[PDB]
Amino acid sequence: EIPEISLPIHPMITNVAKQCYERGEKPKVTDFGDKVEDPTFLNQLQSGVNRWIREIQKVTKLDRDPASGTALQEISFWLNLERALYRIQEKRESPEV
Amino acid sequence: MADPKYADLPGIARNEPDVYETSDLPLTSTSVEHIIV
Amino acid sequence: IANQPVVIDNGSGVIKAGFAGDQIPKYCFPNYVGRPKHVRVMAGALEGDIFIGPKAEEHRGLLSIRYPMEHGIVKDWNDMERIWQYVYSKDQLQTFSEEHPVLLTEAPLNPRKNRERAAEVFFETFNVPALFISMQAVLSLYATGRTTGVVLDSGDGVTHAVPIYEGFAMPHSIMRIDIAGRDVSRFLRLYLRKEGYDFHSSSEFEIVKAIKERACYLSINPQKDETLETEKAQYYLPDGSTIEIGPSRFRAPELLFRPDLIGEESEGIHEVLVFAIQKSDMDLRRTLFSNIVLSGGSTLFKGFGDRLLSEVKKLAPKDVKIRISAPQERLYSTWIGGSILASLDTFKKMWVSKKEYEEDGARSIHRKTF
Amino acid sequence: IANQPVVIDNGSGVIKAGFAGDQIPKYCFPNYVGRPKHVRVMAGALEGDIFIGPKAEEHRGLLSIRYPMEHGIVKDWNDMERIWQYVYSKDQLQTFSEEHPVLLTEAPLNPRKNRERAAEVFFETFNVPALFISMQAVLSLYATGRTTGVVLDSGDGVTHAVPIYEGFAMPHSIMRIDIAGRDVSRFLRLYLRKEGYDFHSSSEFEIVKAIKERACYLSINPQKDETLETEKAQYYLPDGSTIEIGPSRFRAPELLFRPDLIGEESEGIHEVLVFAIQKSDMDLRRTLFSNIVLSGGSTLFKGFGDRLLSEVKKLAPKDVKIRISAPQERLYSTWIGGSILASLDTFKKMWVSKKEYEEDGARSIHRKTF
Ligand SMILES: Nc1ncnc2c1ncn2[C@@H]1O[C@H](COP(=O)(O)OP(=O)(O)O)[C@@H](O)[C@H]1O
Ligand SMILES: Nc1ncnc2c1ncn2[C@@H]1O[C@H](COP(=O)(O)OP(=O)(O)O)[C@@H](O)[C@H]1O
To answer: How many helices and strands (H and E) does chain B possess?
Structure first.
């Protein structure tokens, strides 16, 4: 039972995203106004995405021993990896990320 | 971006157009027959 | 039992596929395989080596496009496996090759090894429940709805005529020459060189095909037009240049009616039709002359049908009604015919089951080849 | 052993270096070795016989400047070693030459000996754990976001054009002329001599560079200002003198667009780029004309973008859209790209270990050149 990782998002981004959601409008970079230019905000974002890369590497570099262990563990292993990576890519492809 | 970073180094040219660009601008028929009598 | 038959129309130049019962083939793309030529340097580049379909067409400059099938004969089976595997990918079908019987179009007079190894490929790597190899002319006549008549096709690598009588495709009257669309493009490339414009890159031969598809026509009089200077229309390359063609636009598809230009003792298309009709029962000649169906992409040139009528009139006996039909789905004739054929209840008894293939082998396919 | 790789932009005009991951190069000192000219008499004077960077920029008059690297090719290895030692010194990095991987850039088409000796220095004098030599084109694409483009850089010594498409570099289309900022400064010196102001010392050569950077522009037309014989804008010297120039603040930078003025048949910078695009594949022209990246300090002249656009527009086929992306970090683009590349983990696979070089040698570097 391979763990799952919920990738965090900057809450301010979600605030403006929900504000774009209260009305019928797609979220975009232009909506932050003069907030994109904040080196503090972008530095926070850089740190967050760096943590995301760390978290995903924790799952993508995973592998088990094909020699030992039961065969069922290997079959279930590859299936669980597909589930993990499938949910990971859906988290990645979200409009917030 | 990093505006103070550009304030640090001396070569970054400000107030110059960053992108130079060129101007923009705005099956056959069937039954080909031929009788013969 | 399976889900639904998948009609995969092959072709040396353009493969066409979709499920049976469909109206038009939803999935059509060129039958080539492009792998990059340059060097991967920057990271984040186009991952993966072999490209097929729209992605291979898009980034055409990087690839070194080759064809795995030529003259209806597969030369490389690995590229064909990747092409068929691409047909079953998420970009085209999104299905599995284990729940679908397969209708497979195939050109006449081909070697036995094509059917044999192609069957091995399907029933072994794909493990399809049922495979059925068939002709192409039979399917085109089924697509038009009528039943007795000859079929004149010229795809990308082959061209042949089959006199079909109520479905029984007469196997003793199938004339077949190997001068089709791709070869016409090749000869056009030679004439473009003689014009002065050089195109020799593998990913530039495709530009020569584009020129053949939108700048060539067929002269009614083959010689009277050669003794004149045409208007020499231009052509815009993808690069943005300009090519004035001149006489290299009507003499290029002239090859189909005279393969002396390529230096070959074969015959023209008109002679393939007349010999296919005359090598049949004398009691059916009038019926065959009154029913000619064209198919295949090479029958799309301007002035093709009209010149074919003139040529056949010169070869047919006097006062015999000649009639050449030309439907609007010559590119999709064999596929639509496959959609009509495989969607019938008799197709269950017409295929070859996987069990049968495992029992007898390739001999079972040659046994039930029709 | 590795912690934050050291990116080094080994440029013949100014060496830019810092650690990996740094958004901005922290140390950008000029690439020259300053030795004194006047004897030391008074005790307690300046120490040492080698002045590099900030010290050899304040006491410029006391020094004689010897550029180590010329046209992207090292002449005195001793001087380059000293400059690299200055990079790892206390006033610059306080690190050891054994604890960090080193990314050292290089111009394309340099001789093999530069790669060999550069690695010999970094593996013998410096016991660097990891060394990777790159191209000074890919890095600008990294630091500009794009992956498809024509990198047209003009450093102080060598300009070139590298067409990279979707991460794939087309090495045979690389054009490279050895005429850049040095030649512009030197030719500006000859224009001042024709205007009556001589400069012969090496320390006063940087004053010529100062004139170039502070007063030279590029006219949109070569003859609309030529025979006009414009005003003579004054310019102050570091002492308090006065230099009026006139027909040299635009006549000196036209050496890049036409090196016939220097007496060398070659191609201008515009012909470098246009020939690098035209040598590439037929399908890849529009994407390369719409993706032109600028780099190098010589691409900072006033009116440089307009001149480059008009020259390419004259040489490109009609109506082709030409976009020239010109970022504000043209001096540090290659370095920032180096800080990006060394901050990745694929770089770990891309470098060369010390034992790799010990068991193989130069061969290992030519193997991982791309
Ligand atoms: N408008 C056109 N004019 C002339 N030739 C064409 C045209 N369109 C396509 N072709 C040629 O016809 C060929 C298509 O035939 P194809 O569908 O490949 O037959 P098959 O699929 O049986 O091989 C293509 O190779 C192309 O070169
Ligand atoms: N603001 C400027 N305007 C014009 N030219 C400049 C400017 N700043 C620097 N240069 C010229 O460009 C060179 C910058 O060197 P660079 O292009 O970085 O060479 P390299 O790429 O080899 O390091 C300087 O030596 C000088 O010749």
So the answer is: 1, 2
